[PDB]
Structure formats: structure tokens, C-alpha cells
Design a protein around this ligand. Sequence first.
Ligand SMILES: [Zn+2]
Ligand SMILES: [Zn+2]
Lengths: 128, 522, 539, 50, 49
Amino acid sequence: ELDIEFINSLLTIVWRFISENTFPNGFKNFENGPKKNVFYAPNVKNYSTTQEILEFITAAQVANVELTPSNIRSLCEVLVYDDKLEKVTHDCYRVTLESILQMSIFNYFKMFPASKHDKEVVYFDEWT
Amino acid sequence: MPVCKNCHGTEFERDLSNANNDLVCKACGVVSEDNPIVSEVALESREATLNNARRKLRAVSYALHIPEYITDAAFQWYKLALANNFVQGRRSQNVIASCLYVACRKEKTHHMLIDFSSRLQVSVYSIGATFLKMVKKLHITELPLADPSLFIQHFAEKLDLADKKIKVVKDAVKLAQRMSKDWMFEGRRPAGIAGACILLACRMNNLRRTHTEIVAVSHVAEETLQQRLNEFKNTKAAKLSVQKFRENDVEDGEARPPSFVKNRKKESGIVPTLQNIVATVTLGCRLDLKTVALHARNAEYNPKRFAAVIMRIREPKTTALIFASGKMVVTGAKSEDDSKLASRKYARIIQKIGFAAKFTDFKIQNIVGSCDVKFPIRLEGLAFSHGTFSSYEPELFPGLIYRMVKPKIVLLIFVSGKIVLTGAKQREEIYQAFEAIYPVLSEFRKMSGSPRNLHLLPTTDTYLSKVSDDPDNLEDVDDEELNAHLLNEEASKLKERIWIGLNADFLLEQESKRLKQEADIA
Amino acid sequence: VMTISSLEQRTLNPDLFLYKELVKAHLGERAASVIGMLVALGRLSVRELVEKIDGMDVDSVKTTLVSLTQLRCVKYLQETAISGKKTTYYYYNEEGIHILLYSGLIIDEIITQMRVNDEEEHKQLVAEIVQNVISLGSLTVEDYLSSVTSDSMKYTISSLFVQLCEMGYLIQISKLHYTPIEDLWQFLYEKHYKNIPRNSPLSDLKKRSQAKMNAKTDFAKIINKPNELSQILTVDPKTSLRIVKPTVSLTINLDRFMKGRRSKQLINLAKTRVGSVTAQVYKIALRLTEQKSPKIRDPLTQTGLLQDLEEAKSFQDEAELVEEKTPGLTFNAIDLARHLPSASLINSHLKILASSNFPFLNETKPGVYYVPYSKLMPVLKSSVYEYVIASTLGPSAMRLSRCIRDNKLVSEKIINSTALMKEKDIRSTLASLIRYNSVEIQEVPRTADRSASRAVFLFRCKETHSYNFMRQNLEWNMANLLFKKEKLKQENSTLLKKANRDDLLPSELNQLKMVNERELNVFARLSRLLSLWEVFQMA
Amino acid sequence: TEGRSRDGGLRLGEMERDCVIAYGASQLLLERLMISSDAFEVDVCDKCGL
Amino acid sequence: NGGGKVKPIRGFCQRLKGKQGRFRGNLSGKRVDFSGRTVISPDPNLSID
DNA sequence: TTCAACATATATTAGTAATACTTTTTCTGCCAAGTTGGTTAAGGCGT
DNA sequence: ACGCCTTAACCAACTTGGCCATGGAGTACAGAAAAAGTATTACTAATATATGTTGAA
Ligand SMILES: [Zn+2]
Ligand SMILES: [Zn+2]
């Protein structure tokens, strides 16, 4: 690409369609509104896009040229590492149900500190 | 500071006698202390330019063989000069040259500006003006004032010859001093009278040398000198004195600089006069300078030389100017009528030939005036007195610079009595500052008086109202020769043609870089 | 400066810093030093104590010691001296107060057997049962029920009766039980080298492995001895149902607590990657298998002897099939009607097993429904970290470290190639990550001997260090938090004396909720941090 | 201070000093190497001596 | 910096180490007050001691 | 030769307005002893 | 039986503070750009030296 930004933009753009790639749309309205046993047997679903993204990239609405499926995979690799998606059998991919982030407990989001006054906190470097 | 615990004596006496080296007061006998405990044996844009600044500073400094200590003066000055941002805007050699010059001058040493500067390519008037600026930017006083009494030595050292020169030097100094006494000194380069008395007393000691040799250390011209040589030959009791006995004449006669003698060449109460009034007028539309420059009697268009249209008019003998944005400066205006009225005439070519561009914002940027008292006055002391509010340097400029804060005007001074008061935007301020400093003028005299009324003539605003203030009054003041100041289309197709044959490279580079714009894209 | 953080109270004390306050938070008093000094210097003798502690010799020495014994806070060894008589040297139990350090969480271990009576006096019953147990630690239904009233149906006052056995609960302390493991292995290393019928003096391997075999297989029934013993389980007196053996005292069973909380983690992590339907399925499935899986227990033998770079695998292989096959008999093949809240056809609904895929489970008897097990738990452990640093420090540290996972000892260009944002950030997140552990460093000499800026700077995972630094975490609040709990005692200590015996003043009324709900914040805040600590201390 | 000139003081070197030890004089050391040498009182703390 | 290689950047382990370095000659070797120094000259009629 | 005379510069205040020019300011590439390794000898260890 | 590798003792390499005491004067790399400030570039418009030259006597 280029060495400067707005990859994160086109990233979070493709992440959307990637969320579509797995089960139906978000259905995050109430707690369990998922595929409901993943339609019929998610075992039957072996799915990903790879090249398809480019046919998907046809939308443009942005200043750029197209990009190679190789570097497409590179774009995939960050959200692998950022854990927004999953890498299965090479070109097949999944979503990490990240969306629950986007929206006892062990999730970092959906957690807020008191973090004023009281000395009872847990900082990280309370000992360095 | 310390006081005894008992006698409470305020004075302590140290005993080094027996080599106890103790401290005790004559009031008690109870010591202050035992065995006084003694001792033995980064990167910043500023700080780095202080490294380099010391490098330059010291190096070029003792290239003159000046004392090392003195250099640190300027080093502070230079550092002090960093504070007011006086340093950045211009060359470095200007800077260091300046701050060293303010040291040596302030410290009264023997070195010369025209000389010191001559270490470079420099016109020497440049760095002179640099030094002149920090007079504004830093804030100084009468401190830098010298005389040949110093510089004859450094000159005398440079000519070798014999030691009688010293005897000659004593002969020369008082000689020049009487010449300083007879009032021919000030207003001229001290080196001139220096080499003068050199040739005089060396002539008194009859050693045959050349004016080339004299000016060689003096760094002036020869005819420059001999003007002062025979300018002595005519002086009071000159040939009466010029013989032996080492000029024991201490007397004076009169003191009459040739300055006002050239005032005799055409031969308060004397009123300063208007010369020019600097102003400005806004049009209100930006336009093409060449398009208006096409048909005119007086104009010039060469943005290569300077970007503007040169405009002037023979009536009422006024110049002014025009700008590109629809602004102008009014110049050559001796009074407000001739100023504002002609200032309206410029809009008459415009609305006649060019665009509309009405007459707006007529405002005085400056007013000029001049006067003379017809007698000598002592600036040396006047400066020594008012050098707070005054500025003078002997060779930097013959006249003296005065600065009045109330009101704010620069005063141009001459021992001829000729005084130029300028730098004011108001008429009355002329005679306000003038008659204000007149008690200093008549205060310093050697061996009219009625200002009448402080304000006599009508004000500036009177003559301003005597001319139409409405921009749309134009054809009324049209001289009808401005109808004729336009020219035919042929003289535009010929004059303008010549302009194009000349400027096709200038415009060619304009449009060519305008093509580089397209190249810039790619 | 000015003590407000007090690095003294904190920075310079690894590990035992927890312990010596725990016992302090428990006892302190006379009892404080002995554990502190012990864990500090290690092996210690009775006579050897008072030459250091100045601990009220041979009384609080004896007193605190038997105190720890009753509560099994020490590891305990005696043998004859080399001349004769007998000598006793001492160690500290496991993590010891580790038992106490859960407590309320061990109280939560009841919530598995909270079932079969929900929200009953039976709840309060088994409650006082357990904490009375854990305060002393070794009791009998003869001793307990003896103290308890004898006018409340025996098979009910003490309602948990057959339920005394289960998985967790209690096992009689015997010999080896609190005896130091590392040596008692060596104690079993006798009788094999020690019994050699002067066979052949060659190849100690034949001597070693065989002894090892013995040492192995003997040790098995050793630790399998507490695993189950029938004389407890079996007893059914006349006109009665099966009971435990009321005779010998039994003690808290820590294993199924480990496996239980580790389960709870898996409920969370798996719950993260799957849906609450499939999740709760996995949850109720694990309720059966957490019975059989050691899951923290396997080390044991690994602890206490040098491995061998091959023979290390000769231990690993045993963990490969162990639970997978023979306990596989105890494991999922066909399970029936676990709970249901779903309804109607339960079969392919139960085939939701196959919905399990990654990065765990999803291995079965090629046409029966089964989850891999003794292979599962191990490579499960390796994964467990995951999330551990994000709002820990920064979002971006994730993807790089995660990337630092897949690649290895690369460098910043190939990072910035793979990675994104800007070197301005890349350094920060990395540098702020290198400030502790994680990346470590790699570098190689470049056209020089070794020099400062010439060479290249490389990055590596080393979860050995990583998984072994989260104890620094232990050193944070589990270190501190306990103090500001204790330190706040002396605040109200005067009132604490009065206020406890009362059931007065406005500020009293105020500071009630202050210090108390404050204690909610500390204690709950602790258990919070604990659920995280439940891993890197063991697996 | 050092030597002659500035001001006085004289040199007990080690090799010079130890000659007194052959006479084993306790106090002569103290008065000599202490009371007349550097007269000072340190203040310390039994607990954690510093 | 400099960088004409000023030799004695060393201040410390030195000041404690040899010769005039304290812990021998400036501590065990203290230069002691109340003394005096002069040249000699014989006096036989002065008693021994 | 001496005049002489004539032109240039020159210090102020305005300007625009524009271009052009330097800076500053970041902001960056001599003996005894440990010390090693290099050698060998034994010694299991499997053939 | 015979060979192999593993462990360990030896020996030769590179290695480092010592080195009279007392006096007694004596003693940070080079290159860029962004900012900013000023010079020039016309005008009055008044100086009196200073200089240049030339030139007429
Ligand atoms: Zn006193
Ligand atoms: Zn202390």
C-alpha cells in the first residue's frame, strides 16, 4: 500500500463483511439471537473469501487502487494477530465473535474502574 | 555577618600570626572558628551557536590583536543580543562585528569601524547600519564617544620612523586639540585631523613623507585631508601661529565651521518648513498593474526591477505611487491640499482608464520639515547630555540623530544650525518638538528668539477638508490634461510593444515556472 | 518519598511475602516468623529455630509447629541421624495457606454440591461443616458429630453422609500425605537400589530404570492410596446405609478444587469462543469429567527429580494417552439427560459436540461423541494465556505479541512490514512491553567483536519467562492488598474490639460501611485477582 | 593540610605508624591518630546501624 | 566531551585505592596535627633522653 | 597645479509586496594466579 | 571380543596488581527543513562629509 494511514479504515470496512461471512448478521439486539445451532450443522459451513474480497473491493468509495490477494492475506494477518478473525486451513477464515467486544467477567471491555481516590486499586506496576 | 556568642562583637579579626590561622573578635577573645577548612588544586541550538560564536568571536577578535578580556564584553552583548532576536535576521559577521564594536567603543580603545569592518568584502556601511539597528534594539546611551587622541597612538605606532614622533605626538595632540578648540573638528572623520597633525608636526620636525603613507593608516583619501590641511591654512592666526615654539597659542579667535559659510554662499523666529508628507491611499480593488500602465504619460512597469507601477505627475509636482492590491503611498506632497487633491488625481486615470478603485484611506504616514538657526551649536556635549534621547557617531553620518519620545520624532542635526525634523504624522508636532528643543538649541551657543505663537497656521485637517474627501468626487478635480494624459492605442501598441520585447523573458520565466506547476504535479 | 506507596512494604520481597503475611493475616503473633524464616531459608530444625528467630524457644516453637500440623501448613520429615537417635527437619506445606487463600472459593466448591439441596439449611449446614473442617482441617464425624447435638437424626443433622465422598471433600492424612514429596520420592528410591540382590554390577540403567519402574509403579499405588480407600467409602453398619469410616480424621481434598476452578476458567474461555447453548453444554459435560482428571496433579513425579532430555518425553508420553483411554471409560461417549433448562429431540441437539472445533476439544471415537482428554488438558494449558495483556497494557501489544507468537526472533522491519501504525507507536508499545519480560532480546555481532550500535535487534516469545512472571502479579495485591486490609484493622482496632461485642456515634455509623464495604472491595477485589492467578501458579 | 608552605601537618605513614605498635601503645595511637587528628562524633542507631 | 582523550576521567575506585588514596595513607596514614619539623644539630651537653 | 564640480552615499519614515536571503531550531545517522580449551585417559556401553 | 562416546584431569595458552616514603613546588558526527526575520526593491527629502575623476585651469 502506502506507508501512511487509512488502512485501519479499509480494515474495519472489510471486518464488517467478514462478520457477515460466518453466520447471519449481528443479531446482538438481545443476548442469544445467533444462528441457533448455526442454521444447520456449522460443520457444513466451510467458508471464506480471499480473492472474493476483491470482487467485494469493487465498491471502492475510497481513494486507492486494487490490491493483490497476497497483500489481502496480509491485511487478514493483523486481525489474526489483533484476534478479530481466525485462520483455519489457510485461505479459510472465521470471525472471533469480536462483535461482543464492539457490542467473574474476564473481558477487558465491559469493565470500568472506580479509579479515583481510594488506594485499594490494582495498578500494574505496584512493584515494577 | 557572624557575631560572637558572648561579647557579640560585629567585627571579627583573623589571626594568621602563629599559623593557627584562626578568627576571633577584639571584643571577646573567644574564637569564631577553628582551622578554616579550605580547598586545594550541552547540545542546544543556542549553546552550539555559542560554541561557534566563541570560535568566530575570539578568532576574528585578536586578528586585530585586541585584548582577550575585552572580547568577553561582546560575548555577553552577543548573548544579550540573542535575547531580543536582533541576531537572527541578518548576517553573522554583522553581529559579531557589531558587538565587538560596541565593546571597544564603550571601552574606549583604539580601533576603527571602517578599519575593523574592512576584514571583509563588506561595504562597511552595511555593518555600520547593523550596529545602528541594535542602538534601537538594545538600549544604550552616551557611552561610545571617542577622539583622535587615542587613534594617533595606534597610528603613530604603525609608521615606525623615529622616536621624535612621540615628541611630535605631544606637539600634534594639543595642535589638534586647538583645532578641536577652534571648532573645525566635529562633523568630520577624526582620522582626518589625526593624519593632518601628523603631517604638520612631522613637518614641524621636517621629515618628508607622503600623503599615501598617512592615509595608509588613516584609510581615508588625500584630497579629503588637504581639504583639512588648507582648511587649517585659513584658520585664526594660522600663519601667525604656524611658526616655531611648538604652537604655544592656546587662544581661540572665533569658531566658524564652513557649514554655515556655504549658507553664506547664497547670502522660533525662523519657522521650520514642510518638505514632503508621506501618506497612503486605499483604492479598494486589486487589479492589473500593466493594464493601467498601458496608457499614461508618467508610469513605469518592470516587476523585474520592482513590482509596482511608477507613477508621478508634474502638477502639483507630486509623485505618490500605486500598489497592486489597490493601495498607494502619497509622496512628493509639500502640503495637504497638493497631497489629497493630487491623491484624488490618481483615481482619475483609474476610473478613466483602468478599473473603478475609489479614493479611500488617505492617511499621513510621515511629514517632513526643516529649519536652520544660522549659528554653530555644540553637539559633542549636547549628545553627551541628551545621548539618552540623542544618537551620533562621528563617521557614521555627519548630522546628529535625536530621538524625542514626546512627541515621537527623529531630529536631524547639524552644527550649521540646519535642522531637519521628520518622522511625524502631524503638522503641529513639528513646531511642538522644534520649539520644545529650541531651549537646548539656544542653550548651547558660543561666543530667532521669538516663537511668536506655538500654533499659527491652520491645522492639517483644515487643508484636508479643503480637498474633496468623497472618493466619487473625481471629474470635479480632473485637470482635463488627465483627459490628455492618456495616449492613443498606437503608442500602446508601440510603447507597450517595446515593453514586451524587453520583458518577454521575465514574463517568460513567470509562465515557464507556471508550467513547472504542471511538472510539479508529476 | 513520603511513604504513600511504600516500596519498602512491596518491591524487595518476592514469593514468601505473600506467605508471611497470610500466616500473619491468619495468626502472626508467635506463629508469624517460623513460616517466614522457613520458606526463607528452607530446611530447618527445631533446635535450629531459636538460634535465628528468638521465638520463645521450644514452646511457640512446639506450639506454632503443631498448629501448622493440625492445619497442615508444613511439610514434615523425620529420620534417624547418621549416628543414631532421630532428627526432624521441616518444610512448608504446598503453598500451605494456599488452602486458606481460597476458603470462600473453596466454599464455592460446595456450589457443585449446592445441588440436590438448593438454598436450604442444608446449605448453612454443609457451610459450617466445611469451615469448621478447614479451621482445624482434620476431623471425624465421631469428633464433629460428637461435638454436634446427638438428638438430630444422625443421617441428617450431618446430612452430607454418603456425599462426604464424591470427588473433593476429605481424605485421611497418612504418612506421605503432608510428608515432603520431593524427598519421599527418594525414600521410595530406596528398596530398589537398596534391594539389589547383588545381581550384576553393570549398566546402572538396568539398575536405574527397573528401580525407576518400581519407583514409578510403587509411587502410583502410593498416591493412588489417598485417591480412594474403601474402608472410608464402604462402611454400612447394621440397619443403616453406606457411611464413611467415622473413625479416622479426614482432611480437605484440594485436587477437585483445582480441577473445579480450572473448569470454571474453561467455562469462561470456551464460553468466549462459543455460544451459551454450546457453552453450557460444554459446562455440564465437564461436570462429570472434572471428577477424573488430575489436571494439576500429574506433575508430582516431574517435581522432585531431574528429567532427561529424552526421558522428559518418557514422562510426556504417559500424559498423552492416560486420561484419553483408561479414564476415557469414565469419559464422554453417550451421556443422557444432563439437565435441560433444548427440549423435544435431544439427540442431534446433543450432537452439538461436533460444533466444538478450535483451539481445543473436537477429537472423538470416530463415530461416538467424545472430547480428547489427557492430550486435551495439556495443549489446552498452552493456549490458556491469550487475552492476558490487552487493557493490561495497550491494545496494540496484542497483535504484535500474538504475531511474535507465530514468527520468532525476526526484527522490526519484518514487524513493521507485518505490523501497522507508526514507528512512533511501534517502539512505544514494544518498548513499554519490553519494560517487563515478554519479548526478551536477541542480537548478533555485526562486523565487529561486540559493539553498541551496529548489530540487529530481535524479539522472542519465551512464555517460560512469560507464564513465569505473572507471579509478579502475585507480588502485587496478593502481596499488598492483604496489608491495607490488615493496616486498616488498627484503624478501627479500638472500635473493632468494641463493635464486635456490642451486638453509637455518628462517625462510627459512617465508617461502618466505609471499613466494611471497604472490606468487600479488598476481599472481593482479591478473589477477582485470584481467578486470574488460578493459572500460572500451577499450569 | 599538605607539607610546608600553605600550612603544616606532618606525615605518619603506615611504615612510619606501625613502629609505634612494636611498643604497643594503646592511647598514643588514639591521641595521635584520633584525638589530635580528626575529632568527630558519629551518631548511629543500634537497630540497623547507620 | 573534549575528545583529545583527557586521561584521568577516573575519580573514585582510585580515590579509595593506592598511595595517597585514602584507605591507606589518608586514613591509616593520617597526617597529624600538633607537630613540627626542622633540621638537626648536635648538642652533647644536652642529656640523652 | 588647484579648482571644481558633480555624482554617489548617506539616516528617517514611511511604505507595499515580493522576492530573496540567512540564520536559528530543531531533528536527524613485571609475576603469581586464575581460565580456557584442548587432550587424554578411563570407562560405560553397546557390539 | 571391539568401538564409542562421555567425563574428567592436565597444560598450555591469555591474564593482572603490585611497584620505598617525606617534601615541594609543581600540574559529544553532518545535513534539512521549517520558521522567521530582514534586504531590496522605488520614492520624497532634507544633509555634510567622503570619494572619484577629470579636467580646466
Ligand atoms: Zn565575640
Ligand atoms: Zn537505625
